[PDB]
Design a protein around this ligand. Structure first.
Ligand code: UUM
Length: 185
């Protein structure tokens, strides 16, 4: 792909984070803590899952960023509406305001309803995410495999401002403690 020149500098929004997440000083890395991180509750925090939003809001244009997923067993990545539900149980779908892919139990899937199997020969260590607001497109790229396409959501109905979306996943196994990292431009 040739989307690199739309690179944006994403930072994580502490106020949206699940209360168990640990965000680095530079707001560029996040991992699951082994306990509650001693923050007050608020209506923005994702309560049920280890999720956090980017601080940036996008309502036009073309945007690109990259995330490091090295050694993780489980994670979700993409974008979502600013007004997605924060509390209780929900599925990641475009109907609920999410355009995402994930790793779970050694398979990669796109967050359609129902979910779509992805075909990845080279397990990615870094994922590129491209959003074209006007075109209604969200695309995912395998940076480890020379930028090869993973998945394109087209005919997207954003219906609001978009925010970068992250889920570091649970760590029931003891094998999923590694962070998500926003990679430098
Ligand atoms: C302060 C403050 C308020 C809340 C709050 O309302 N949380 C909530 C709402 N619905 N559910 C299921 C949880 N959390 O912190």
């Amino acid at each position: 792909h040739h989307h690199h020149h739309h690179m944006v500098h994403i930072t994580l929004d502490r106020n949206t984070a699940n209360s168990w997440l640990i965000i680095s000083k530079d707001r560029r890395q996040v991992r699951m803590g082994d306990t509650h991180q001693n923050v007050s509750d608020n209506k923005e925090r994702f309560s049920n899952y280890p999720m956090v939003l980017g601080a940036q809001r996008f309502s036009s244009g073309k945007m690109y960023w990259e995330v490091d997923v090295t050694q993780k067993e489980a994670w979700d990545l993409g974008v979502c509406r600013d007004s997605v539900q924060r509390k209780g149980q929900f599925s990641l779908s475009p109907e609920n305001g999410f355009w995402t892919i994930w790793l779970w139990q050694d398979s990669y899937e796109a967050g359609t309803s129902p979910q779509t199997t992805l075909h990845i020969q080279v397990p990615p260590c870094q994922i590129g995410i491209f959003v074209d607001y006007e075109a209604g497109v969200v695309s995912f790229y395998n940076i480890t495999d020379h930028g090869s396409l993973i998945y394109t959501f087209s005919e997207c109905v954003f219906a609001g401002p978009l925010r970068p979306f992250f889920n570091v996943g649970f760590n029931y196994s003891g094998g999923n403690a590694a962070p998500l990292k926003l990679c430098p431009l």
